[PDB]
């Protein structure tokens, strides 16, 4: 064999290349099905959705029949007629790259939409009693006396005139009709600096937004209780955080000319999280919709007693009929989940006068108590999801609900549960701390809906749509393959045959109608881009379990296979570790016989993430293919730790992060290198971002033999610097894993790095709030004093993201030039 050398292009030339391949370049989302209720009309439903180059509410008409010779192309009608810190941070937390309207709220009975475009909060009406428009609607600005920006606006389900929002970390409730506005929480003074003012109501802490993808801390109660005179009592449940005790970090201010730092709260691993607790506002109203009064209530006992051991409010909300408010609750180590009903009778008014408090406590019965309706444990971890469905209350002594759990089988499946709401043994009157089991409820039934060596999908907007009429439950899953996410359906009363609805060979992300008679699917594969098509469901007269599917219309046709993009082929191997580890291979374009090629290995292979599966890798992973075309082999492997393959697989690196990963990357690279005589193993490079950059550094530290060069992007060089929500989940408290932390921290092992230059390259966003720049700066400090070289590049306008276009152009240009000059080209192998 003979080595192939890629073409030495100049910096200016490589920029022309990357400029021109870029020269030609998001689908719709947040669908909602609203019935037209037109006896005489052609259309059954009307769908609404957000689409993009701005991002606005569209609608499209759904016809009762279709011509089955032709493809109905659904036409897009626009519903709408034409940065703060609180936004730009949230946009980082939500990982939302594109500007416009990120989401919206809607009230069924009225028709009221509610959404936040720019600084403004707006509302429009369509779909309700007030009809269906045939032209764009002009957005109604919700007006305010609030100085700063307003976040997280939500329609009250009970009265759609009222809305709430956050303002300077406090809750407010403007009325879209009376224009009455009121501050419901007086917890945080907007003027007083953060160092001495850390309380905040209705908001999700940094950790809950970053690590538990929960972006809100208040939940409107769906029903309104009537008053004697004629008004009504609304309710908002909220989380009151006190971040007083949490660490204060300094991250560089984006305005580099100021040369100052923003102080924000970062629960470093092993330190304390904020002092969370529950609370509830009782908004009293008269018949006129005027606010009579607002009583603000608190738990009858501390949160540390009633929810003993709870360190996180992962999710929360209300039961369908507003009777109890519920809450999903993790212990600190995140191995013990709970599901706790919380009666509004637990909350009593706040009182300064000491003997009025005393009185109010005794008016509350002993029988009122937190009802823990489910508890689960594990020796790996809970993965929080959005799945939870509570059925209406059949019997007043019980609560039927569906939930998902990895904890039973080792894989995530659906379980129907009836819990019995027992009067708790514990009686507050006697005065004492409840026993470890005093609030637990008996489980009457627990019927596993699904089961097997595959998982149901709950993260990232996958959920369940439950048909409470036919008594079915729809769900995405990995049953047909780990590489394809498909829609399924099954009875929740007589569990049995699961029925796949989506077509084989693709990876779908469905959004089933609230009426369960339709479902949309954004699908693609390795070859084709992502079409979005509508599909109609049908029960045969003789058998409601059997749902059959028929293509109805196309919402968005695919572009078609991109010209000048050879996709990769999706390989596997039997691992020495007893698993079928999957990988992706970009063969170099226009291969030569008898010539070995320089190999680049892209990587992430960390938790919550699969890279290797059947989807179009032309959008985001475009350059992997541009690389290949220039003459690099490109490999991608999902080491043990990747998602969508069960808990025990994901758990393999627990307490052990960075120690098992490269073993699999090399394993697959060697399995490949035997079969593929064109793979030059002497010239392997590696590169990734975040956990990717972490492993790239590990790769070079451990396996100088396999990897010639490593390019680490915003890497974790030190676990004592990351946050609680993540590191404790996967590595635990630093005292309970003294040795895993040290082995998993590359900056502690700086002397292990290679004394050859032109091998380590560090990239980092300088304003990185998440993976703080310190990680790089301290790695460098210890490198400097261990006497090892590095090449560094900083992206000063950036965070845990690349958002400025010219910053991303530079990253790409440089990485290619670096790869050329130190791996691929003939001058690179000369240097050695």
């Amino acid at each position: 064999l003979e080595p192939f050398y890629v073409e030495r292009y100049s910096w200016s030339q490589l920029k022309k290349l990357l400029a021109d391949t870029r020269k030609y370049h998001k689908a719709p989302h947040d669908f909602m099905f609203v019935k037209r209720n037109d006896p005489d009309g052609p259309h059954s439903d009307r769908i609404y959705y957000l689409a993009m180059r701005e991002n606005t509410l569209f609608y499209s008409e759904i016809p009762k029949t279709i011509n089955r010779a032709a493809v109905l192309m659904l036409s897009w009608k626009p519903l709408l007629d034409l940065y703060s810190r609180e936004e730009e941070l949230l946009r980082e937390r939500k990982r939302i790259g594109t500007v416009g309207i990120a989401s919206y709220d809607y009230h069924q009975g009225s028709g009221t939409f509610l959404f936040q475009a720019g600084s403004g909060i707006y509302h429009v009406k369509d779909g309700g009693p007030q009809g269906f428009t045939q032209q764009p609607l002009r957005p109604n600005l919700v007006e305010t006396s609030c100085p700063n920006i307003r976040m997280d606006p939500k329609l009250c389900p009970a009265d759609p005139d009222w809305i709430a929002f956050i303002h300077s970390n406090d809750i407010w409730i403007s009325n879209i009709v009376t224009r009455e506005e009121r501050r419901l929480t007086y917890v945080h003074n907007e003027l007083a600096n953060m160092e001495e003012d850390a309380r905040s109501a209705g908001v999700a802490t940094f950790v809950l937004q970053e690590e538990f993808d929960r972006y809100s801390g208040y939940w409107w109660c769906p029903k309104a209780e009537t008053t004697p005179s004629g008004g009504k009592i609304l309710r908002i449940l909220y989380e009151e955080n006190d971040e007083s005790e949490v660490e204060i970090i300094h991250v560089t201010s984006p305005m580099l000319e100021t040369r100052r730092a923003d102080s924000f709260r970062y629960p470093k691993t092993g330190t304390a999280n904020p002092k969370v607790t529950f609370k509830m506002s009782e908004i009293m109203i008269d018949a006129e919709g005027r606010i009579i009064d607002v009583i603000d209530k608190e738990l009858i006992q501390p949160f540390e007693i009633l929810f003993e051991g709870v360190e996180y409010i992962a999710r929360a909300g209300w039961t369908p009929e507003g009777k109890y408010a519920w809450s999903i609750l993790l212990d600190r180590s995140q191995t013990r989940l709970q599901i706790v009903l919380i009666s509004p009778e637990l909350f009593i008014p706040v009182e300064d006068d000491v003997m009025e408090r005393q009185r109010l406590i005794e008016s509350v019965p002993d029988s009122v108590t937190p009802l823990i309706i489910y508890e689960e444990t594990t020796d790996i971890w809970i993965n929080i999801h959005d799945i939870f469905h509570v059925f209406p209350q059949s019997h007043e002594e019980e609560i039927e609900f569906i939930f998902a759990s990895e904890c039973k089988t080792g894989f995530r499946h659906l379980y129907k549960i009836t819990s019995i709401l027992k009067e708790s043994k514990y009686k507050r009157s006697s005065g004492g701390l409840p026993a470890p089991s005093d609030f637990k409820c008996p489980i009457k039934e627990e019927i596993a809906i699904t089961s097997g060596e595959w998982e149901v999908l709950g993260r990232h907007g996958s959920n369940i749509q439950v048909d409470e009429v036919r008594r079915l439950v729809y769900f995405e899953g990995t049953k047909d393959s780990p590489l394809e996410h498909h829609l399924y359906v099954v009875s929740y009363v007589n569990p049995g045959e699961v029925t796949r609805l989506t077509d084989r060979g693709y990876s779908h992300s469905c959004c089933i109608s609230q009426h369960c008679d339709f479902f949309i699917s954004k699908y693609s594969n390795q070859k084709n881009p992502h079409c979005v098509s509508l599909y109609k469901l049908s029960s045969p007269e003789d058998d409601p379990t059997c749902k059959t599917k028929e293509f109805w219309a196309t919402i968005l046709d695919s572009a078609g296979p991109l010209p000048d993009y050879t996709p990769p082929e999706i390989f596997s191997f039997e691992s020495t570790t007893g698993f079928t580890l999957y990988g992706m291979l970009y063969k170099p374009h226009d291969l030569q016989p008898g010539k070995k090629y320089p190999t680049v290995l892209f990587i992430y292979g960390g938790p919550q993430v699969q890279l290797v599966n059947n989807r179009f890798k032309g959008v985001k992973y475009f350059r992997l293919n541009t690389l290949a075309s220039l003459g690099y082999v490109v490999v991608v492997i999902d080491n043990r730790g990747s998602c969508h393959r069960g808990l025990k697989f994901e758990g393999a690196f627990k307490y052990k992060m960075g120690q098992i990963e490269i073993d699999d990357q090399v394993e697959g690279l060697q399995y490949l290198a035997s079969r593929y005589d064109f793979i030059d193993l002497d010239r392997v490079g590696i590169h990734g971002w975040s956990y990717g950059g972490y492993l790239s550094l590990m790769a070079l530290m451990q396996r100088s033999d396999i990897f010639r060069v490593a390019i680490a992007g915003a890497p974790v060089t030190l676990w004592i610097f990351y946050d609680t929500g993540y590191t404790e989940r996967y590595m635990g408290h630093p005292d309970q894993n003294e040795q895993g932390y040290y082995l998993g921290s590359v900056a502690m092992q700086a002397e292990k790095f290679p004394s050859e230059p032109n091998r380590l390259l560090l990239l980092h966003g300088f304003l990185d709030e998440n993976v703080h720049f310190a990680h790089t700066s301290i790695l460098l400090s210890f490198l400097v004093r261990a006497g090892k070289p590095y090449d560094l590049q900083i992206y000063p306008q950036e965070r845990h993201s690349i958002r400025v276009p010219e910053s991303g152009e530079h990253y790409e240009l440089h990485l290619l030039h670096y790869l050329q000059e130190n791996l691929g080209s003939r001058i690179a192998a000369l240097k050695v």
Partner: peptide, 8 residues
């Protein structure tokens, strides 16, 4: 997460 956001 430990998860960046670039979109080329």
């Amino acid at each position: 997460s430990l998860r960046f956001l670039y979109e080329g």
